[PDB]
């Protein structure tokens, strides 16, 4: 129907939201395959990305895709997919599935003192 | 900057303008810390007076190794042609 | 090279790097009203700490009272009585009218439109009469307290609030006749201070500073407090993120505050106005002078104060300047261990440097107007 | 009990919308 | 539950374009603003004639402090120091002793009116209605130390303003 | 209220509104400065029986925070809450 | 316990506990504690090396989207060897939720600045520099924001006194506002207000 | 005993940063005396800079002298940019403060302070 505005300032209307979400979700899965399988970030993000990708592949309509992705406008769903891709690329470098780097001191989180 | 003798005389002129150094004990090979009895910051403001006179910035790694007027005139000779 | 203007000492110091007419850098120097409020709070009881909140956003007194009261009541695990909650929502929207009159009319006064200032401050004087009739003070009421409110409404106050509210929309209409369609007012606000939605979220903006950019967020709707889920109102949403849509959002919030005030006047319940836990709220003076337990509780609440159970909350309200938060840490004693005050104007004035890039020097006073900045809450 | 309360039927309707009353001639008529 | 301020697309027929061109060239909204300013020119102004006319106040009004008495001349203050305990500014300084008939009475009752935040926590903490924040607001001074009230000043304020303070308390004590 | 009808008509014409119906100056319509005395109600804890304070002690039902994780399968990924419901446009006045 | 007691929200408590488990198992490298208060607020207590990886997670993860930094706070607790407790309050507008991220530092260990995650942090941690003395590494313009320009010390430290060490007055000899050691005409009266009876048995600490 | 550094790995890099901060203050003192139109000399301001550097001369911790260099750079930034007024620059010279009693006997005469 070619939505005129997203309503959010600085968030332009995406012309082809379905193909853009398919590209972003397969790119998230490609980046996310470089994480070990036992990492919870990989399991959880593959789970939610496969759910969103199946919803995108199942719905031709743009408005109904917005109501069942449940993330607002379709352009901020695209923006969140970009943020998840950037996050996964950072999580490869951080490697935060590793064990805890240091225990806190024994009364560090004791409240009240 | 032309001859080494003029650079040495100008180094000694800068050091005799510096009021904490005794001009009677001020020689070319006199050490600042253990002979002339100076603080490190005294040597730092000596090096800044040398930068004022000779017109080039002396970095920190090669100003810490300037502990006598002979080292100063050799450093100014090495950063120029002479 | 480029010009550096030190606009010296609300009160604000500004360090401008200008490149002719354009603004290259805006560095707001603050602390000119830093009074160390939240260090003073650590040496006072919770009741004693309450009147500091009147003096942070000093055009939004009972709203900051409400935010601090909600924080203390959350840590105390008690709730105010329903009539207290309706009085808090009524006076919170009267307070919102006070603050948006102050915001819009001083923002017009700093641009050059000096007359609707004088027109709307008589209405503001009548609302200060409402504060004075309910508490005894025109501005710093110390009225909304942890446990409810201090004192019940005097007889005949709601009729006068009705007589104010019945006429106030015409005052908004003639303000809007002076400014909204005026081409001089539009030339000072329409392309000025454009904030994208993502930058407004990232820079910690709240309130109209989000809603002018099209972000559908209002804490009275999304994270509702006292009885705001029982009142019906709309949330004005901007479309261009500029000074003009934020102006229109504040005008329409005055409209919706009048709507909420009508609903509060019609739905005011009977009953008590303090929580009937006399280990938190002081008993009535007639039973203080008659009952032994009531006299003991009066004594201890006005000397020691109530003990608050240990823990930390972040309690936020939709104040008329945006999200007003208290991060309150209790150690178990009757005095706050820590009270961080989150003010909207702090992050808004931090975003002033991005908002002023590419604009003129006369646009900066408009951007400092559209960010409703009171330096009491900015500096604490 | 006697308390500050609304009246029995409640208060009357309170206007809260924009009323810019659209006065003046048409743009054809003003030229 | 939300509305869009400023999301109107203007009509582009020749009627509305000519309306906007007439507004641009013939300054219509500027004459509207002049009409609104002219309308307030012929209104009665809101100005009261101070000092002959006064701003309206309530009996709850928090003004100048006073120490009160019983209806026998005995002062109400029994030196319990609740008012200085609750005082958020620490504006109240109290010293006490038994006086010559053994009564628990103050020897020092100071209120620094320049520390005081005028919030009235002292009058609501007072168990005997001794300290009140009375109705006077017209007590500006020429010197700072004239606002450092001792017990003699506060008892004279009580004796000065009691005819008004007692009637304001009579109007409001059932709300307290 | 004391304005003559010529000035009143000029004033209503210049504002474009009926100004006498909604005057910003207050008159006899406001409440009396002397009111009858109130009789304020009491709260729910003003009872002579079944009113033990331990059955209504709010501060003593506050608990320390429940430690979910401390350092001394195919479970569903979760969010902190369900996603927020999309706001509906105003039926009252959407400006559409 | 109906009228005077705050009603407990068990649904939000269960949801925030599940999301705290979620965050603790996605990021076990830095998460030290996860707790949910009785008024349903989630606290993630982390190691200070994970300021940037945790906050970037909560900002960018599709099940978190904590896009708003509501507040950034330090708390001085002098009985801890890491006396400063850095507190991040985050708002997710997508999931209508708030989270608290807590970490710690002493006087000398720098905390990594989170301006690359939230630009909102730019002044807040700057305030934490001014009030507490916590240095933030890789901050763009870290300097004082609230105290006077030549102010010595960090005022919101609990060993800093209420009135400071200096006070200002105009001196007419030097024609200048001058700073002198503080003398008070009336000392601030310290009130010992704590009852010697236990108030909350649920918060009783185990004895020695 | 393994702590995280601020800028300096040891005391030599720390002394390098101290030395550069002293160079920058030494260069700035004449401009500070000029543009604040101070009533002190350049020699007196440089003696005050030397006094403030020698006051902290006992510190052997690299993190503490890193924070001292950071705070000295902040004071220098507040001086070069005219953010301080003349009063803030002259607060280093405690001119209106009367000299404290130094020996035992005058402190005995004036009061109770040790
Ligand atoms: C145009 C030129 C001025 C014409 C006179 C005028 O406008 O009189 C106001 C008169 C009353 O106006 P209003 O605002 O409806 O009166 C409300 C008052 O509250 C109603 O008035 P009031 O109840 O307050 O009556 C008391 C008032 C009575 O008011 C007067 O006497 C008005 C002054 C008349 C001259 O007297 C005073 O207050 C003493 C005024 C003394 C100073 C007068 C200075 C006059 C300027 C020239 C010197 O205006 C009209 O009747 C309409 C205009 C008539 C124009 C006639 C053709 C010219
Ligand atoms: C003796 C009395 C003298 C004064 C009389 C007026 C008194 C009252 C004045 C009240 C207002 C005062 C406000 C002060 C600030 C004014 C600002 C302002 O208006 O700026 C000017 C504004 C500026 O408009 P603008 O820039 O805001 O509007 C945007 C315009 N665009 C989109 C193009 C960028 O208007 C003008 O420039 C108009 C100038 C005067 C035109 C007069 C009418 C000419 C009509 C000719 C006939 C046309 C017929 C159709 C065509 C066919 C021709 C054959
Ligand atoms: C006009 C008034 C302006 C006032 C300016 C105030 C600036 C204050 C800046 C303070 C910065 C410092 O004090 S950092 C110094 C701390 N350094 C140390 O503790 C290490 C010991 N350092 C020294 O002894 C220094 O003299 C040297 C030069 C680094 C080494 O000397 P030693 O060798 O012999
Ligand atoms: S009104 Fe408040 S600040 Fe003033 S003396 Fe009473 S308690 Fe203290
Ligand atoms: S609270 Fe009342 S009785 Fe007690 S010391 Fe104060 S004025 Fe006197």
mmCIF file with all atom_site columns, N, CA and C in Angstrom, chain C residues 44 47-48 55 119 132 134-136 140-141 145 150-152 155 174 177 183 221 235 237 245 252 256 285 289 298, chain E residues 1-3 5-6 23-24 29-30 32 40 43 58 60-62 85-86 88 117 121 124-127 129 172 175-176:
data_model
loop_
_atom_site.group_PDB
_atom_site.id
_atom_site.type_symbol
_atom_site.label_atom_id
_atom_site.label_alt_id
_atom_site.label_comp_id
_atom_site.label_asym_id
_atom_site.label_entity_id
_atom_site.label_seq_id
_atom_site.pdbx_PDB_ins_code
_atom_site.Cartn_x
_atom_site.Cartn_y
_atom_site.Cartn_z
_atom_site.occupancy
_atom_site.B_iso_or_equiv
_atom_site.pdbx_formal_charge
_atom_site.auth_seq_id
_atom_site.auth_comp_id
_atom_site.auth_asym_id
_atom_site.auth_atom_id
_atom_site.pdbx_PDB_model_num
ATOM 1   N N  . UNK C 1 44  ? 18.499  13.601 56.879 1.00 0.00 ? 44  UNK C N  1
ATOM 2   C CA . UNK C 1 44  ? 17.152  13.980 57.267 1.00 0.00 ? 44  UNK C CA 1
ATOM 3   C C  . UNK C 1 44  ? 16.248  12.766 57.140 1.00 0.00 ? 44  UNK C C  1
ATOM 4   N N  . UNK C 1 47  ? 10.116  12.149 55.913 1.00 0.00 ? 47  UNK C N  1
ATOM 5   C CA . UNK C 1 47  ? 9.250   13.316 55.987 1.00 0.00 ? 47  UNK C CA 1
ATOM 6   C C  . UNK C 1 47  ? 10.049  14.606 55.862 1.00 0.00 ? 47  UNK C C  1
ATOM 7   N N  . UNK C 1 48  ? 11.220  14.666 56.498 1.00 0.00 ? 48  UNK C N  1
ATOM 8   C CA . UNK C 1 48  ? 12.079  15.839 56.369 1.00 0.00 ? 48  UNK C CA 1
ATOM 9   C C  . UNK C 1 48  ? 12.683  15.969 54.978 1.00 0.00 ? 48  UNK C C  1
ATOM 10  N N  . UNK C 1 55  ? 11.338  21.725 45.683 1.00 0.00 ? 55  UNK C N  1
ATOM 11  C CA . UNK C 1 55  ? 12.291  22.742 45.302 1.00 0.00 ? 55  UNK C CA 1
ATOM 12  C C  . UNK C 1 55  ? 13.233  22.276 44.203 1.00 0.00 ? 55  UNK C C  1
ATOM 13  N N  . UNK C 1 119 ? -1.138  36.837 30.227 1.00 0.00 ? 119 UNK C N  1
ATOM 14  C CA . UNK C 1 119 ? -2.501  36.317 30.184 1.00 0.00 ? 119 UNK C CA 1
ATOM 15  C C  . UNK C 1 119 ? -2.632  35.027 30.982 1.00 0.00 ? 119 UNK C C  1
ATOM 16  N N  . UNK C 1 132 ? -2.668  26.916 47.809 1.00 0.00 ? 132 UNK C N  1
ATOM 17  C CA . UNK C 1 132 ? -2.685  27.567 49.110 1.00 0.00 ? 132 UNK C CA 1
ATOM 18  C C  . UNK C 1 132 ? -3.908  27.152 49.917 1.00 0.00 ? 132 UNK C C  1
ATOM 19  N N  . UNK C 1 134 ? -5.350  24.225 49.703 1.00 0.00 ? 134 UNK C N  1
ATOM 20  C CA . UNK C 1 134 ? -5.254  22.838 50.123 1.00 0.00 ? 134 UNK C CA 1
ATOM 21  C C  . UNK C 1 134 ? -4.101  22.591 51.097 1.00 0.00 ? 134 UNK C C  1
ATOM 22  N N  . UNK C 1 135 ? -3.078  23.450 51.118 1.00 0.00 ? 135 UNK C N  1
ATOM 23  C CA . UNK C 1 135 ? -1.901  23.151 51.924 1.00 0.00 ? 135 UNK C CA 1
ATOM 24  C C  . UNK C 1 135 ? -1.456  24.309 52.803 1.00 0.00 ? 135 UNK C C  1
ATOM 25  N N  . UNK C 1 136 ? -1.755  25.533 52.398 1.00 0.00 ? 136 UNK C N  1
ATOM 26  C CA . UNK C 1 136 ? -1.273  26.701 53.093 1.00 0.00 ? 136 UNK C CA 1
ATOM 27  C C  . UNK C 1 136 ? -0.133  27.415 52.411 1.00 0.00 ? 136 UNK C C  1
ATOM 28  N N  . UNK C 1 140 ? 5.356   25.655 47.495 1.00 0.00 ? 140 UNK C N  1
ATOM 29  C CA . UNK C 1 140 ? 5.964   24.450 48.053 1.00 0.00 ? 140 UNK C CA 1
ATOM 30  C C  . UNK C 1 140 ? 5.019   23.935 49.117 1.00 0.00 ? 140 UNK C C  1
ATOM 31  N N  . UNK C 1 141 ? 4.104   23.091 48.669 1.00 0.00 ? 141 UNK C N  1
ATOM 32  C CA . UNK C 1 141 ? 2.959   22.714 49.475 1.00 0.00 ? 141 UNK C CA 1
ATOM 33  C C  . UNK C 1 141 ? 3.328   21.741 50.580 1.00 0.00 ? 141 UNK C C  1
ATOM 34  N N  . UNK C 1 145 ? 2.345   13.300 50.485 1.00 0.00 ? 145 UNK C N  1
ATOM 35  C CA . UNK C 1 145 ? 3.300   12.693 51.391 1.00 0.00 ? 145 UNK C CA 1
ATOM 36  C C  . UNK C 1 145 ? 3.289   11.184 51.204 1.00 0.00 ? 145 UNK C C  1
ATOM 37  N N  . UNK C 1 150 ? -1.407  15.156 53.086 1.00 0.00 ? 150 UNK C N  1
ATOM 38  C CA . UNK C 1 150 ? -1.324  15.603 54.472 1.00 0.00 ? 150 UNK C CA 1
ATOM 39  C C  . UNK C 1 150 ? -2.691  15.912 55.059 1.00 0.00 ? 150 UNK C C  1
ATOM 40  N N  . UNK C 1 151 ? -3.584  16.476 54.265 1.00 0.00 ? 151 UNK C N  1
ATOM 41  C CA . UNK C 1 151 ? -4.799  17.029 54.822 1.00 0.00 ? 151 UNK C CA 1
ATOM 42  C C  . UNK C 1 151 ? -5.878  16.915 53.762 1.00 0.00 ? 151 UNK C C  1
ATOM 43  N N  . UNK C 1 152 ? -7.118  16.740 54.200 1.00 0.00 ? 152 UNK C N  1
ATOM 44  C CA . UNK C 1 152 ? -8.191  16.560 53.238 1.00 0.00 ? 152 UNK C CA 1
ATOM 45  C C  . UNK C 1 152 ? -8.526  17.899 52.587 1.00 0.00 ? 152 UNK C C  1
ATOM 46  N N  . UNK C 1 155 ? -13.782 22.284 52.244 1.00 0.00 ? 155 UNK C N  1
ATOM 47  C CA . UNK C 1 155 ? -15.100 22.331 51.629 1.00 0.00 ? 155 UNK C CA 1
ATOM 48  C C  . UNK C 1 155 ? -15.194 23.499 50.660 1.00 0.00 ? 155 UNK C C  1
ATOM 49  N N  . UNK C 1 174 ? -7.017  31.183 23.390 1.00 0.00 ? 174 UNK C N  1
ATOM 50  C CA . UNK C 1 174 ? -6.488  32.485 23.002 1.00 0.00 ? 174 UNK C CA 1
ATOM 51  C C  . UNK C 1 174 ? -4.959  32.533 23.031 1.00 0.00 ? 174 UNK C C  1
ATOM 52  N N  . UNK C 1 177 ? -4.462  31.116 19.756 1.00 0.00 ? 177 UNK C N  1
ATOM 53  C CA . UNK C 1 177 ? -4.754  32.141 18.763 1.00 0.00 ? 177 UNK C CA 1
ATOM 54  C C  . UNK C 1 177 ? -3.562  33.069 18.581 1.00 0.00 ? 177 UNK C C  1
ATOM 55  N N  . UNK C 1 183 ? 2.765   33.215 11.823 1.00 0.00 ? 183 UNK C N  1
ATOM 56  C CA . UNK C 1 183 ? 3.885   32.858 10.960 1.00 0.00 ? 183 UNK C CA 1
ATOM 57  C C  . UNK C 1 183 ? 5.223   33.222 11.589 1.00 0.00 ? 183 UNK C C  1
ATOM 58  N N  . UNK C 1 221 ? 0.296   6.110  30.890 1.00 0.00 ? 221 UNK C N  1
ATOM 59  C CA . UNK C 1 221 ? -0.337  5.053  30.114 1.00 0.00 ? 221 UNK C CA 1
ATOM 60  C C  . UNK C 1 221 ? 0.394   3.723  30.243 1.00 0.00 ? 221 UNK C C  1
ATOM 61  N N  . UNK C 1 235 ? -2.837  11.034 24.368 1.00 0.00 ? 235 UNK C N  1
ATOM 62  C CA . UNK C 1 235 ? -1.422  11.368 24.420 1.00 0.00 ? 235 UNK C CA 1
ATOM 63  C C  . UNK C 1 235 ? -1.069  12.078 23.115 1.00 0.00 ? 235 UNK C C  1
ATOM 64  N N  . UNK C 1 237 ? 1.015   13.311 20.091 1.00 0.00 ? 237 UNK C N  1
ATOM 65  C CA . UNK C 1 237 ? 2.193   12.758 19.440 1.00 0.00 ? 237 UNK C CA 1
ATOM 66  C C  . UNK C 1 237 ? 2.605   13.701 18.322 1.00 0.00 ? 237 UNK C C  1
ATOM 67  N N  . UNK C 1 245 ? 6.207   21.092 17.057 1.00 0.00 ? 245 UNK C N  1
ATOM 68  C CA . UNK C 1 245 ? 5.395   19.954 17.476 1.00 0.00 ? 245 UNK C CA 1
ATOM 69  C C  . UNK C 1 245 ? 5.466   19.736 18.976 1.00 0.00 ? 245 UNK C C  1
ATOM 70  N N  . UNK C 1 252 ? -1.640  20.606 23.801 1.00 0.00 ? 252 UNK C N  1
ATOM 71  C CA . UNK C 1 252 ? -2.623  19.535 23.853 1.00 0.00 ? 252 UNK C CA 1
ATOM 72  C C  . UNK C 1 252 ? -2.549  18.765 25.169 1.00 0.00 ? 252 UNK C C  1
ATOM 73  N N  . UNK C 1 256 ? -5.625  17.925 27.617 1.00 0.00 ? 256 UNK C N  1
ATOM 74  C CA . UNK C 1 256 ? -5.889  16.621 28.206 1.00 0.00 ? 256 UNK C CA 1
ATOM 75  C C  . UNK C 1 256 ? -5.810  16.662 29.725 1.00 0.00 ? 256 UNK C C  1
ATOM 76  N N  . UNK C 1 285 ? -5.264  14.698 64.997 1.00 0.00 ? 285 UNK C N  1
ATOM 77  C CA . UNK C 1 285 ? -4.873  15.413 66.205 1.00 0.00 ? 285 UNK C CA 1
ATOM 78  C C  . UNK C 1 285 ? -5.848  15.182 67.347 1.00 0.00 ? 285 UNK C C  1
ATOM 79  N N  . UNK C 1 289 ? -4.486  13.447 70.886 1.00 0.00 ? 289 UNK C N  1
ATOM 80  C CA . UNK C 1 289 ? -4.701  14.045 72.193 1.00 0.00 ? 289 UNK C CA 1
ATOM 81  C C  . UNK C 1 289 ? -5.621  13.217 73.080 1.00 0.00 ? 289 UNK C C  1
ATOM 82  N N  . UNK C 1 298 ? 2.473   9.524  67.068 1.00 0.00 ? 298 UNK C N  1
ATOM 83  C CA . UNK C 1 298 ? 2.720   10.908 66.682 1.00 0.00 ? 298 UNK C CA 1
ATOM 84  C C  . UNK C 1 298 ? 4.119   11.357 67.073 1.00 0.00 ? 298 UNK C C  1
ATOM 85  N N  . UNK E 2 1   ? -6.149  6.367  21.976 1.00 0.00 ? 1   UNK E N  1
ATOM 86  C CA . UNK E 2 1   ? -5.528  6.744  23.235 1.00 0.00 ? 1   UNK E CA 1
ATOM 87  C C  . UNK E 2 1   ? -4.353  7.685  22.986 1.00 0.00 ? 1   UNK E C  1
ATOM 88  N N  . UNK E 2 2   ? -4.070  7.944  21.714 1.00 0.00 ? 2   UNK E N  1
ATOM 89  C CA . UNK E 2 2   ? -3.122  8.978  21.339 1.00 0.00 ? 2   UNK E CA 1
ATOM 90  C C  . UNK E 2 2   ? -3.697  9.745  20.161 1.00 0.00 ? 2   UNK E C  1
ATOM 91  N N  . UNK E 2 3   ? -3.225  10.972 19.984 1.00 0.00 ? 3   UNK E N  1
ATOM 92  C CA . UNK E 2 3   ? -3.608  11.780 18.840 1.00 0.00 ? 3   UNK E CA 1
ATOM 93  C C  . UNK E 2 3   ? -2.369  12.407 18.222 1.00 0.00 ? 3   UNK E C  1
ATOM 94  N N  . UNK E 2 5   ? -0.815  15.556 16.896 1.00 0.00 ? 5   UNK E N  1
ATOM 95  C CA . UNK E 2 5   ? -0.719  16.986 16.631 1.00 0.00 ? 5   UNK E CA 1
ATOM 96  C C  . UNK E 2 5   ? 0.120   17.185 15.373 1.00 0.00 ? 5   UNK E C  1
ATOM 97  N N  . UNK E 2 6   ? -0.361  18.055 14.483 1.00 0.00 ? 6   UNK E N  1
ATOM 98  C CA . UNK E 2 6   ? 0.322   18.468 13.251 1.00 0.00 ? 6   UNK E CA 1
ATOM 99  C C  . UNK E 2 6   ? 0.603   17.283 12.318 1.00 0.00 ? 6   UNK E C  1
ATOM 100 N N  . UNK E 2 23  ? -3.890  34.391 2.962  1.00 0.00 ? 23  UNK E N  1
ATOM 101 C CA . UNK E 2 23  ? -3.346  34.482 4.313  1.00 0.00 ? 23  UNK E CA 1
ATOM 102 C C  . UNK E 2 23  ? -1.898  34.953 4.294  1.00 0.00 ? 23  UNK E C  1
ATOM 103 N N  . UNK E 2 24  ? -1.127  34.523 3.294  1.00 0.00 ? 24  UNK E N  1
ATOM 104 C CA . UNK E 2 24  ? 0.268   34.942 3.193  1.00 0.00 ? 24  UNK E CA 1
ATOM 105 C C  . UNK E 2 24  ? 0.381   36.410 2.802  1.00 0.00 ? 24  UNK E C  1
ATOM 106 N N  . UNK E 2 29  ? -3.698  35.968 9.835  1.00 0.00 ? 29  UNK E N  1
ATOM 107 C CA . UNK E 2 29  ? -3.488  35.507 11.203 1.00 0.00 ? 29  UNK E CA 1
ATOM 108 C C  . UNK E 2 29  ? -2.828  36.577 12.066 1.00 0.00 ? 29  UNK E C  1
ATOM 109 N N  . UNK E 2 30  ? -2.118  37.522 11.449 1.00 0.00 ? 30  UNK E N  1
ATOM 110 C CA . UNK E 2 30  ? -1.548  38.634 12.192 1.00 0.00 ? 30  UNK E CA 1
ATOM 111 C C  . UNK E 2 30  ? -2.640  39.588 12.657 1.00 0.00 ? 30  UNK E C  1
ATOM 112 N N  . UNK E 2 32  ? -5.644  38.524 13.202 1.00 0.00 ? 32  UNK E N  1
ATOM 113 C CA . UNK E 2 32  ? -6.275  37.735 14.263 1.00 0.00 ? 32  UNK E CA 1
ATOM 114 C C  . UNK E 2 32  ? -5.584  37.937 15.611 1.00 0.00 ? 32  UNK E C  1
ATOM 115 N N  . UNK E 2 40  ? -8.149  41.941 24.753 1.00 0.00 ? 40  UNK E N  1
ATOM 116 C CA . UNK E 2 40  ? -7.757  42.165 26.146 1.00 0.00 ? 40  UNK E CA 1
ATOM 117 C C  . UNK E 2 40  ? -7.598  43.634 26.507 1.00 0.00 ? 40  UNK E C  1
ATOM 118 N N  . UNK E 2 43  ? -10.799 44.600 28.249 1.00 0.00 ? 43  UNK E N  1
ATOM 119 C CA . UNK E 2 43  ? -11.213 43.842 29.418 1.00 0.00 ? 43  UNK E CA 1
ATOM 120 C C  . UNK E 2 43  ? -10.799 44.593 30.669 1.00 0.00 ? 43  UNK E C  1
ATOM 121 N N  . UNK E 2 58  ? -6.271  31.508 52.538 1.00 0.00 ? 58  UNK E N  1
ATOM 122 C CA . UNK E 2 58  ? -7.037  30.509 53.257 1.00 0.00 ? 58  UNK E CA 1
ATOM 123 C C  . UNK E 2 58  ? -6.641  30.526 54.728 1.00 0.00 ? 58  UNK E C  1
ATOM 124 N N  . UNK E 2 60  ? -5.490  28.048 56.214 1.00 0.00 ? 60  UNK E N  1
ATOM 125 C CA . UNK E 2 60  ? -4.348  27.156 56.329 1.00 0.00 ? 60  UNK E CA 1
ATOM 126 C C  . UNK E 2 60  ? -3.020  27.847 56.083 1.00 0.00 ? 60  UNK E C  1
ATOM 127 N N  . UNK E 2 61  ? -3.029  29.150 55.776 1.00 0.00 ? 61  UNK E N  1
ATOM 128 C CA . UNK E 2 61  ? -1.865  29.834 55.221 1.00 0.00 ? 61  UNK E CA 1
ATOM 129 C C  . UNK E 2 61  ? -0.679  29.836 56.172 1.00 0.00 ? 61  UNK E C  1
ATOM 130 N N  . UNK E 2 62  ? 0.487   29.542 55.625 1.00 0.00 ? 62  UNK E N  1
ATOM 131 C CA . UNK E 2 62  ? 1.705   29.374 56.402 1.00 0.00 ? 62  UNK E CA 1
ATOM 132 C C  . UNK E 2 62  ? 2.531   30.647 56.275 1.00 0.00 ? 62  UNK E C  1
ATOM 133 N N  . UNK E 2 85  ? 12.835  18.643 66.337 1.00 0.00 ? 85  UNK E N  1
ATOM 134 C CA . UNK E 2 85  ? 13.202  17.345 65.790 1.00 0.00 ? 85  UNK E CA 1
ATOM 135 C C  . UNK E 2 85  ? 12.708  17.201 64.361 1.00 0.00 ? 85  UNK E C  1
ATOM 136 N N  . UNK E 2 86  ? 11.488  17.667 64.085 1.00 0.00 ? 86  UNK E N  1
ATOM 137 C CA . UNK E 2 86  ? 10.910  17.489 62.760 1.00 0.00 ? 86  UNK E CA 1
ATOM 138 C C  . UNK E 2 86  ? 11.344  18.575 61.788 1.00 0.00 ? 86  UNK E C  1
ATOM 139 N N  . UNK E 2 88  ? 12.771  20.564 59.118 1.00 0.00 ? 88  UNK E N  1
ATOM 140 C CA . UNK E 2 88  ? 13.626  20.097 58.022 1.00 0.00 ? 88  UNK E CA 1
ATOM 141 C C  . UNK E 2 88  ? 14.813  20.993 57.783 1.00 0.00 ? 88  UNK E C  1
ATOM 142 N N  . UNK E 2 117 ? 11.879  27.031 56.248 1.00 0.00 ? 117 UNK E N  1
ATOM 143 C CA . UNK E 2 117 ? 11.355  26.767 54.922 1.00 0.00 ? 117 UNK E CA 1
ATOM 144 C C  . UNK E 2 117 ? 9.857   26.921 54.860 1.00 0.00 ? 117 UNK E C  1
ATOM 145 N N  . UNK E 2 121 ? 5.836   22.005 59.375 1.00 0.00 ? 121 UNK E N  1
ATOM 146 C CA . UNK E 2 121 ? 5.941   20.710 60.040 1.00 0.00 ? 121 UNK E CA 1
ATOM 147 C C  . UNK E 2 121 ? 5.978   20.875 61.551 1.00 0.00 ? 121 UNK E C  1
ATOM 148 N N  . UNK E 2 124 ? 2.325   21.071 62.917 1.00 0.00 ? 124 UNK E N  1
ATOM 149 C CA . UNK E 2 124 ? 1.643   19.791 62.885 1.00 0.00 ? 124 UNK E CA 1
ATOM 150 C C  . UNK E 2 124 ? 2.301   18.764 63.792 1.00 0.00 ? 124 UNK E C  1
ATOM 151 N N  . UNK E 2 125 ? 3.576   18.952 64.129 1.00 0.00 ? 125 UNK E N  1
ATOM 152 C CA . UNK E 2 125 ? 4.226   18.112 65.118 1.00 0.00 ? 125 UNK E CA 1
ATOM 153 C C  . UNK E 2 125 ? 3.907   18.543 66.534 1.00 0.00 ? 125 UNK E C  1
ATOM 154 N N  . UNK E 2 126 ? 3.454   19.771 66.717 1.00 0.00 ? 126 UNK E N  1
ATOM 155 C CA . UNK E 2 126 ? 3.250   20.304 68.046 1.00 0.00 ? 126 UNK E CA 1
ATOM 156 C C  . UNK E 2 126 ? 2.044   19.645 68.691 1.00 0.00 ? 126 UNK E C  1
ATOM 157 N N  . UNK E 2 127 ? 2.212   18.982 69.833 1.00 0.00 ? 127 UNK E N  1
ATOM 158 C CA . UNK E 2 127 ? 1.099   18.254 70.443 1.00 0.00 ? 127 UNK E CA 1
ATOM 159 C C  . UNK E 2 127 ? 0.102   19.135 71.165 1.00 0.00 ? 127 UNK E C  1
ATOM 160 N N  . UNK E 2 129 ? -0.525  22.598 70.200 1.00 0.00 ? 129 UNK E N  1
ATOM 161 C CA . UNK E 2 129 ? -0.776  23.758 69.331 1.00 0.00 ? 129 UNK E CA 1
ATOM 162 C C  . UNK E 2 129 ? -0.032  25.001 69.812 1.00 0.00 ? 129 UNK E C  1
ATOM 163 N N  . UNK E 2 172 ? -9.974  25.289 60.785 1.00 0.00 ? 172 UNK E N  1
ATOM 164 C CA . UNK E 2 172 ? -9.235  24.238 60.098 1.00 0.00 ? 172 UNK E CA 1
ATOM 165 C C  . UNK E 2 172 ? -8.943  22.995 60.936 1.00 0.00 ? 172 UNK E C  1
ATOM 166 N N  . UNK E 2 175 ? -9.981  19.500 59.979 1.00 0.00 ? 175 UNK E N  1
ATOM 167 C CA . UNK E 2 175 ? -9.236  18.860 58.909 1.00 0.00 ? 175 UNK E CA 1
ATOM 168 C C  . UNK E 2 175 ? -7.913  18.280 59.382 1.00 0.00 ? 175 UNK E C  1
ATOM 169 N N  . UNK E 2 176 ? -7.528  18.529 60.626 1.00 0.00 ? 176 UNK E N  1
ATOM 170 C CA . UNK E 2 176 ? -6.227  18.117 61.127 1.00 0.00 ? 176 UNK E CA 1
ATOM 171 C C  . UNK E 2 176 ? -6.328  16.895 62.038 1.00 0.00 ? 176 UNK E C  1
#
